[PDB]
Design a protein around this ligand. Structure first.
Ligand SMILES: Cc1cc2nc3c(=O)[nH]c(=O)nc-3n(C[C@H](O)[C@H](O)[C@H](O)COP(=O)(O)OP(=O)(O)OC[C@H]3O[C@@H](n4cnc5c(N)ncnc54)[C@H](O)[C@@H]3O)c2cc1C
Ligand SMILES: Cc1cc2nc3c(=O)[nH]c(=O)nc-3n(C[C@H](O)[C@H](O)[C@H](O)COP(=O)(O)OP(=O)(O)OC[C@H]3O[C@@H](n4cnc5c(N)ncnc54)[C@H](O)[C@@H]3O)c2cc1C
Ligand SMILES: COc1ccc(OC)c2c(C)cc(=O)[nH]c12
Ligand SMILES: COc1ccc(OC)c2c(C)cc(=O)[nH]c12
Ligand SMILES: COc1ccc(OC)c2c(C)cc(=O)[nH]c12
Ligand SMILES: [Zn+2]
Ligand SMILES: [Zn+2]
Lengths: 230, 230
């Protein structure tokens, strides 16, 4: 309670394991008294491409299109497209942002990559100065809640896929830490599709339980050592 | 060379540094007598979202949609959307696939992540089993040609961003090696926007010059040790 949460959710099927993890997060955080908002990217048909449509009115340089410069200037001039500014409002108000998605190619599904690319623009999420520890979203918490096709064992250092931490680097460090977030420990639900009726219940309930004390948690130290060393 | 090359290119502006890099690759590979195809994903308005529009037949499970299961079936039955099969034909014929893109959030722009999520489907690019060294695209080469905002110094072990190889992992290992590609060493053009006019010219020529002898290169050992060290 006393806290706002945004859940950015990227799965096509409400009946999925991901849908159930999103729905228990809404149920538990709402029960606590928290303010909860969900960006259901597939239901929003969220646009993932970074294009000159993201700037309304006239371009800062209509001869040579530079997306990073154009969106930084549009942010400053309040001329970003309304899909982007609608998500920036949600993020500005939120104390915690939870991303709920299936792992696609050791990363986020493209529709959620497009949310990161287009919503987290210069002047909003980071700047010169203001990145990593001083990123502009500092004071906010972020959490990846990821489901995988691969088993926890495939995801060990000398397993086929390498350690989980290795694929988290670009998301936790290159994106969430960069913008100033304190990153809570990821929630990894390994291989739900090959698990029992039960077991899947256990993974959902562990997530609901964890959410009971989410505001007591300490952030991970979001460092190269955390992801790569021992 | 009697070889076919596919360049999958992700930049909005033909006059950009990335556009110069793509065009020098076409110029040099064409000069060598290679067969060259470019998939210019923004000009194509390439769809990045993985949705049930990607399958045109009867779904295997119309009550609970599972993108992986439905696209795997659809590939076997030939009922995937034609944009996906257009790209699969290009990849099937290619001996080398070059990806040319600006780094976005330590990864690929979302339009290109969509190309990976939708084009590299089960059945086509990998099977379970039939992945990493037994992936379905064995015998083919792939190369990432990436441009960055950050300087080379920023992308070292003790730099802010950590080593450049760390962010390559989900792309080289988790996607290309997974599909059975041999991965050539990445071409990383650091911080062109801050470079001098003539440093930019030097990076473009360094890539043209490397392309002269590309068919003589051996692939990297695409392992955890190469990416992260000891
Ligand atoms: C393009 C693509 C790329 C991929 N890349 C990777 C990758 O790099 N690495 C990797 O490891 N995997 C990868 N995968 C696999 C993907 O990560 C998994 O398929 C996904 O994470 C499984 O989550 P899901 O919600 O879609 O499972 P679901 O199939 O929706 O759920 C599993 C089962 O649980 C049921 N269920 C729903 N709610 C509940 C609940 N209340 N309690 C109990 N059961 C419930 C479902 O109906 C279903 O039978 C990829 C898949 C695709 C399509
Ligand atoms: C959403 C987003 C996320 C980003 N995330 C990251 C990230 O995680 N890490 C990171 O390091 N960076 C990041 N960046 C920055 C991005 O990677 C760089 O801006 C991009 O790599 C620079 O490439 P470009 O082709 O767009 O440069 P350009 O701005 O086109 O190139 C700079 C100059 O090169 C010139 N040029 C073009 N052709 C030639 C030629 N033949 N000879 C000489 N000069 C030429 C152009 O005219 C221009 O003046 C991000 C940017 C965005 C928009
Ligand atoms: C059934 O789907 C999957 C199951 C398990 C996987 O890794 C253990 C993958 C990977 C790595 C890529 C992918 O595209 N699909 C996968
Ligand atoms: C021009 O924009 C940028 C320049 C340099 C960068 O790193 C040195 C970044 C990073 C790391 C993330 C990002 O989103 N944008 C960047
Ligand atoms: C770590 O962040 C950064 C690294 C390197 C950069 O250029 C060399 C930038 C620029 C140009 C703008 C910016 O906002 N952030 C940057
Ligand atoms: Zn970090
Ligand atoms: Zn590898």
């Amino acid at each position: 309670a006393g806290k706002k949460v945004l859940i950015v959710y990227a799965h096509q099927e409400p009946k999925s394991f991901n849908g159930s993890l999103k729905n228990v997060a809404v149920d538990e955080l709402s029960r606590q008294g928290c303010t909860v908002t969900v960006s259901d990217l597939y239901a929003m048909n969220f646009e993932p491409r970074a294009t000159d449509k993201d700037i309304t009115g006239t371009l800062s340089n209509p001869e040579v299109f530079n997306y990073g410069v154009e969106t930084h200037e549009a942010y400053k001039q309040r001329s970003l497209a309304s899909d982007i500014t609608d998500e920036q409002k949600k993020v500005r108000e939120a104390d915690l942002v939870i991303f709920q998605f299936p792992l696609y190619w050791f990363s986020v599904p493209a529709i959620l990559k497009g949310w990161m690319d287009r919503v987290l623009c210069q002047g909003f999420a980071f700047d010169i100065p203001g990145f990593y520890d001083s990123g502009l979203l500092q004071g906010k918490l972020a959490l990846l809640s990821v489901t995988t096709g691969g088993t926890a064992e495939m995801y060990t250092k000398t397993g086929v896929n390498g350690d989980s931490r290795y694929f988290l680097w670009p998301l936790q460090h290159g994106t969430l830490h960069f913008c100033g977030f304190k990153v809570l420990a990821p929630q990894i639900s390994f291989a739900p599709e090959i698990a029992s009726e039960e077991e899947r219940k256990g993974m959902v309930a562990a997530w609901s339980q964890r959410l009971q004390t989410i505001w007591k948690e300490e952030p991970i130290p979001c460092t190269a050592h955390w992801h790569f060393g021992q």
